[PDB]
Amino acid sequence: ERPTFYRQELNKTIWEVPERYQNLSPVGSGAYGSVCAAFDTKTGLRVAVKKLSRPFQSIIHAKRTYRELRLLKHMKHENVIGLLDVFTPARSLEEFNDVYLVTHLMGADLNNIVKCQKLTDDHVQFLIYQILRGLKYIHSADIIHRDLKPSNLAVNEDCELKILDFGLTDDEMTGYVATRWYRAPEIMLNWMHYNQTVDIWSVGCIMAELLTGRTLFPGTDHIDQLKLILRLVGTPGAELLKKISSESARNYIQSLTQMPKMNFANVFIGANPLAVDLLEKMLVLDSDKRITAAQALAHAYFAQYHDPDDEPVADPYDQSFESRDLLIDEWKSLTYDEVISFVPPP
Numbered sequence: 001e002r003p004t005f006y007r008q009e010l011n012k013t014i015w016e017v018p019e020r021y022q023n024l025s026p027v028g029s030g031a032y033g034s035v036c037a038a039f040d041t042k043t044g045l046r047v048a049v050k051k052l053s054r055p056f057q058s059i060i061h062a063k064r065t066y067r068e069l070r071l072l073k074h075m076k077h078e079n080v081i082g083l084l085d086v087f088t089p090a091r092s093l094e095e096f097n098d099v100y101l102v103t104h105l106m107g108a109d110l111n112n113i114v115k116c117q118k119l120t121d122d123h124v125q126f127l128i129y130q131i132l133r134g135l136k137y138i139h140s141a142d143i144i145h146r147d148l149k150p151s152n153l154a155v156n157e158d159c160e161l162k163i164l165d166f167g168l169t170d171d172e173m174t175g176y177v178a179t180r181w182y183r184a185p186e187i188m189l190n191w192m193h194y195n196q197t198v199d200i201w202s203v204g205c206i207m208a209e210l211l212t213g214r215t216l217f218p219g220t221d222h223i224d225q226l227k228l229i230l231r232l233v234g235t236p237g238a239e240l241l242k243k244i245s246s247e248s249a250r251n252y253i254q255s256l257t258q259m260p261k262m263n264f265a266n267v268f269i270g271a272n273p274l275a276v277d278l279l280e281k282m283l284v285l286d287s288d289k290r291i292t293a294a295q296a297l298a299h300a301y302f303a304q305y306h307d308p309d310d311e312p313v314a315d316p317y318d319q320s321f322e323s324r325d326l327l328i329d330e331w332k333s334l335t336y337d338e339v340i341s342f343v344p345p346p
């Protein structure tokens with residue numbers, strides 16, 4: 001049956017949640033909503049509860065809400081943020097106006113833990129292994145993160161990791177900002193229709209930073225960042241130039257003085273040669289030629305962690321809704337069906 005709900009004001013907004021969730025405390029901002037820590041008395045888990053802000057105020061918002069719920073409901077993997085619960089105080093579709101999403105409460109994001117700090121090779125191995133393990137799963141469902149960065153990697157005290165905010169402005173991408181430093185050049189500069197390996201570029205940037213304690217490509221703007229990238233990996237050859245479908249972007253790239261790829265062993269001085277090799281395979285300008293998550297897990301760098309029988313893939317994920325044009329109430333009804341049909345994990 002329907003649980004008993006109780007009301008509380010937290011972020012100058014009234015939160016209405018089932019009794020099972022106790023000791024609500026603000027954590028901060030989440031994607032498209034605010035997040036509270038809580039204790040789930042039913043499972044004994046410390047949980048993060050996100051209340052979506054105005055989830056059905058427009059078509060964009062309504063579809064966005066449906067999108068996030070569909071994504072979270074699908075993801076069932078140790079290294080990916082999944083859905084422990086989803087609820088609404090609404091008793092019917094006509095009353096339906098709020099959506100609350102529940103997942104594991106994590107200790108900190110990777111950024112807050114590692115900033116300015118050089119990690120030991122074993123710690124890097126374990127962290128990157130988990131990211132790749134989660135990404136293999138995400139990619140197998142034909143989902144792309146698109147925005148992978150340290151702040152979207154949630155980690156506990158024992159370094160257990162989960163990927164947050166997968167599959168989801170111009171101002172926040174401007175200037176000397178971490179929001180752009182981990183982005184593949186093809187997505188940063190709209191070169192072409194990009195693939196799953198945009199995420200692998202991001203993993204390369206994250207891995208380098210864990211190994212050195214320094215941002216790999218701390219560009220002051222898009223152009224400065226491109227220059228930093230091209231200095232390391234070399235200017236594109238004729239082969240990649242043809243794949244840049246944007247005539248304007250292709251034309252600009254051609255104006256740059258050619259540079260050869262640098263020696264990664266001279267860039268990452270002292271690093272495990274296996275780590276250097278993997279970075280070389282991740283940080284390839286031509287996305288067609290980048291290592292995949294599945295391939296990277298089999299790389300000798302992860303010898304102590306790799307297990308082909310314990311690196312699962314996802315069930316098929318139907319995202320035909322993405323190409324669908326619907327009204328607010330139609331997206332709302334689809335979302336409502338997904339809320340009501342939710343079955344909690346074991």
Ligand SMILES: C[C@@H](Cn1ncnn1)Nc1ncc2cc(Oc3ccc(F)cc3F)c(=O)n(C)c2n1
Nearest residue numbers: 030035048049050101102103105106107108109154
């Ligand atoms: C104390 C911080 C340290 N931290 N870890 C990662 N980021 N910040 N712990 C923590 N735990 C979990 C989350 C979950 C978030 O999104 C959700 C996703 C799906 C849901 F069903 C519910 C969510 F709330 C989120 O936005 N944040 C900021 C979180 N923060």
